[PDB]
Amino acid sequence: VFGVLILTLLGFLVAATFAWNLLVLATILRVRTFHRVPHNLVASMAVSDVLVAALVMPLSLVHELSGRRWQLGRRLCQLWIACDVLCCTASIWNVTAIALDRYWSITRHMEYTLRTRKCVSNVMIALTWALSAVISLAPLLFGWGETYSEGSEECQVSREPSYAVFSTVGAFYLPLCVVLFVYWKIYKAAKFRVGSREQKEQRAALMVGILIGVFVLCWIPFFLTELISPLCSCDIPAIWKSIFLWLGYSNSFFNPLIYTAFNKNYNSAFKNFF
Amino acid sequence: SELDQLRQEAEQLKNQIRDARKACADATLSQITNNIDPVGRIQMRTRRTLRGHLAKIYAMHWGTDSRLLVSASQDGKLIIWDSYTTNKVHAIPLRSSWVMTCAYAPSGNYVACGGLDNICSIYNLKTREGNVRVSRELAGHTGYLSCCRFLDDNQIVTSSGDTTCALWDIETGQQTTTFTGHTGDVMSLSLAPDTRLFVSGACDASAKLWDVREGMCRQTFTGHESDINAICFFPNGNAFATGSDDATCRLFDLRADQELMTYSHDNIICGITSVSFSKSGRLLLAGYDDFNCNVWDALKADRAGVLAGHDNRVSCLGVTDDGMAVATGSWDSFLKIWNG
Amino acid sequence: IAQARKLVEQLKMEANIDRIKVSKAAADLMAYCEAHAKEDPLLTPVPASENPFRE
Amino acid sequence: DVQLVESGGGLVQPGGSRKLSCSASGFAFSSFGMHWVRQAPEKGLEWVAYISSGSGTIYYADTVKGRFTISRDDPKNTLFLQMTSLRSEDTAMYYCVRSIYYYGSSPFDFWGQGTTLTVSSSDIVMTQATSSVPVTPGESVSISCRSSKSLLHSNGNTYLYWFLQRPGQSPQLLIYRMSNLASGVPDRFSGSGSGTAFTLTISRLEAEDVGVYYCMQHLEYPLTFGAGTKLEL
Amino acid sequence: LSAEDKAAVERSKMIDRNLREDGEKAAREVKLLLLGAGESGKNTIVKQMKITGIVETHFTFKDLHFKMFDVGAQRSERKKWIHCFEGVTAIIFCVALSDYDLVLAEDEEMNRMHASMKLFDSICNNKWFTDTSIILFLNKKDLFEEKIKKSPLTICYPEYAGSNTYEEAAAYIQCQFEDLNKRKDTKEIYTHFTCSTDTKNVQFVFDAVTDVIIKNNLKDCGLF
Ligand SMILES: NCCc1c[nH]c2ccc(C(N)=O)cc12
């Protein structure tokens, strides 16, 4: 690449996104006050975020380390290109899940009891992981696209013109719209519940903006390029695609920076831990 | 007129008592135990953990057979555990959910509890039907109850926040005797092994020794600074240890009527919640407000170990009759059984 | 005004007891602790053969 | 004030269908498991079925399963036993027994009156050494029985029970777990045993003490009953 | 294990199933602590919203179940039992406006309107009630109107410096009770002028509880 600095940065990213998620997963089980309804979603978020860092990122690193040629045959390409489209989709839908909870607990605090809450929560933790599997094992256990490259070993997710639009729409655009709408509603509610000093007004907007920007800037260029490239039959340089791939993988680093670090109980537990 | 000379006579009497107390003090107990082999190191691990209380836990009491247990929480529930298998035997609902004390009868047939309603309730565990029911409600106190102890199957002694203690008769429900002399709320009780005398610690930073049969005060001990929260009797029956909010525990002797030693540190600034001894009287376990429990050498004042396993402050503490285990309760709603 | 009389009477009653030296009592506690030392499961750890709380 | 009422019975042809009913009052019926015990003429007792609180556990006898069922009604405090595929060997009078299980409980304390049922025409074994033993008034005698399997468990608690049936009267519990005396029984009776041999000792025998004794085991299901011993003057 | 321990396990399972079932029934309730001083009007407040030791009251308005604990008959040390009530949704405080002209009975050099301020200062700034809101009620306003024409407010505070009217005195009195709160970043105080009014007394409590619940839900996201 462009010097060993990039490789060192990628290795540091791998180590950080593995260690932080391991620490969070250990903390949730270690602390016995972390057994409430809104904490199961964070555990699913952490496990989905660590399953990609542990065994999907080093494979891509060695794949792109020297030449676009896969090390093994069809025994690994199918397996590596599987969790890549399953352990990433299950993270986007986990962010959408935490958002819909906060909305129904501020917009409808009456019907959202201590039961309805737990029920809808666990139902969502299932549908999320179910849909992930469906898409990942669709161009394989039904026959579609390539996912077989050739002797050139060009391991790549299917480039079928229909599979691209189907997967992108079912994975990103719907969660993006849902998250934007619910956070707009939440921000308006928080604005209204203040007026009827200024930090309470200038911190809520900052928090919501940080959430939306972190979620959007790390995924919006990749997905839009994928949908545009195959369909519009347009070719892009192999460097921009790689950079977008690292941005998508690096979103997992920022993902626990928000939902866990800025909390009170989680920060106190982290400080208690060595 | 006569008030001034009465005050002077009282002051000179107090001075005479203190002079006799100082004159009868030969030497400290620390010098005697200078050449005593220390205990060393004490290690204890959590053997059992009991769950089911969805609220703070305020009191507990061990059964006389060293197997059964009773716990009371501000969720309005009274649970009887089986410590060996962590099973549940009974679950009694209370009329009022503000409960701060509980007790277990020596015979094993009755259980008592009280709280902010100024009423002590007595339950029958061996009815003909397969359920428990209230057998007698005792009323007459003008303040919240603090402690409760069973003399036998037909007698009971309680202490409340109206600066009085009383001895009841369960069959008739009438106060047989009343005890007066405290100028502050009474917070603890401790029955002697002979079941002939008892001690009580109050908020006026003092303790007194009562006579159950004559109903009069015999001795009073001072030396604490802020307030007394717990009290316990030595297994021999001639000494007792107290615990306060000044973060200090002290040992008093009845026969010499003085204070023997104090148990203080420098990293401890929170008050003591409960105090209990060991079967031989060599250790002294005291719960603290900083979620920890300490073990002190009773004859040398050295911390032998630490029992740190709780999330919130420790509220209750007890030792089995045979001395094989120690149980701890806390505000995190978990009971843990430790062993050595 | 009877409170002062009651207090002084109680003080007079409490000053007529008999007291002993501290060293005697300290010896009596040390002797009791030494005598009952062998039967203290917490002080001397016991083998897990006869420990009822066998996890 | 425990009272037991039963309904149903009478002569019927083989293969008939009916239901045995039980009524309970004076105690919490929802916290007690129930048992069915039958006794054929000139025969000992025989455990039939068992249902626990909450209807979470049901058991049937080896010769009973398939042609019988059990149920309970918490709001009405009623117990049922449906009759189907009857045979000529089922002529017996059915009893109802209550039992509660926790640390220190005494099961089989109260027995019902029962109703007569008749129609128109391995495992631990309890053995009693002597069928009938003469009794001398004012003296002390003992009754002994043994088992093929030891009734001593790891926890230290043994499961042996003693029941006394007066002539023409419902049986009552005397001693449970071979060393504990049931409430309401005089201190004359005393139980003993060691591992596999159990002897029941009576300080003195009176006019009321005459009856038939039975031995029981509760280590595992089914529950086997030893043959009764006829006390003759 | 041995045909007599499985029954114990199932009995314990029934016991803790019943415990869990009963636990969530008492979690969908609002707990309020009623405080005050003397005859400030707690009885009138209970009469306006109604259905020895601790006295309890239950009432429902709009499918919200309310529990109110009155602890005015203890006379013991407040320090030793005030930590039992930590975790209540809100605290209701009752003050009598027509108390500036009156003093205590056993003590003459003590205004009856200063003891109430001292009690409010002690209750509001406590290590246990840092995140608990307070609802303030000023009870006797008609008698205050009757007595304000002839008597001046300068007797209590000789710094009023205003015309002896209703608005300029009531606003000053309300302000005097609101700067005693030194935790403005975490606590909110709701005030209501009422006197033998109608359902207005209950509607105000309902609105305050709804606001408190909404803000508590918002604070869990780090968003408020
Ligand atoms: N490395 C992440 C790629 C990914 C996650 N989810 C997806 C959903 C669809 C497609 C695609 N190639 O169409 C790719 C992905």
Residue numbers in the entry:
A (entry chain R): 38 to 233, 276 to 353
B (entry chain B): 2 to 341
C (entry chain C): 9 to 63
D (entry chain E): 1 to 121, 136 to 247
E (entry chain A): 5 to 55, 182 to 354
Quote the original article.
The 5-hydroxytryptamine 5A receptor (5-HT5AR) belongs to the serotonin receptor family, which is classified as a group of G protein-coupled receptors (GPCRs) that are primarily associated with neuropsychiatric diseases. 5-HT5AR is widely expressed in the central nervous system, including the cerebral cortex, hippocampus, cerebellum, olfactory bulb and dentate gyrus. 5-HT5AR predominantly signal through Gi/o, and also recruit β-arrestin upon activation. The synthetic agonist 5-carboxamidotryptamine (5-CT) is commonly used as a tool ligand to evaluate the function of serotonin receptors, particularly the 5-HT5AR, given its ten-fold higher affinity compared to 5-HT.
To understand the molecular mechanism of 5-HT5AR signaling through Gi and β-arrestin, we analyzed the structure of 5-CT stimulates 5-HT5AR/Gi1 complex by cryo-electron microscopy (EM) with an overall resolution of 3.13 Å. The residues of 5-HT5AR and ligand were well defined in the density map, except for the intracellular loop 3 (ICL3) due to the high flexibility. By constructing the receptor residue-ligand atom contact matrix, we found 5-CT form tight hydrophobic interactions with C1253.36 and F3016.51 and salt bridge with D1213.32. The amide group and the indole amine of 5-CT also interact with S2045.42 and T1263.36 by hydrogen bond. The binding pose of 5-CT exhibits slight conformational differences compared to that in a previous determined 5-CT/5-HT5AR/Gi complex structure, indicating heterogeneity of 5-CT/5-HT5AR interaction. S2045.42A abolished the β-arrestin2 recruitment and retained efficacy in Gi1 dissociation, indicating that the polarity of 5.42 was essential for β-arrestin2 recruitment. Although V19445.52 did not form intense interaction with 5-CT, V19445.52A reduced potency for both Gi dissociation (ΔpEC50 = -0.841 ± 0.1, p < 0.001) and β-arrestin2 recruitment (ΔpEC50 = -1.151 ± 0.08, p < 0.001), indicating its importance in ligand binding. Given its strategic location on ECL2, this residue is hypothesized to function as a putative gatekeeper for the binding pocket. Mutagenesis and molecular dynamics simulations reveal distinct functional roles: D1213.32 (Energy = -41.5 ± 9.5 kcal/mol, 55.4% of total) and E3056.55 (Energy = -17.7 ± 10.8 kcal/mol, 23.6% of total) dominate 5-CT binding energetics, whereas S2045.42 facilitates β-arrestin recruitment through conformational rearrangement without significant binding energy contributions. In contrast, V19445.52 in 5-HT5AR widens this cavity, allowing E3056.55 to form a productive hydrogen bond with the 5-carboxamide group of 5-CT, thereby playing a positive, selectivity-determining role.
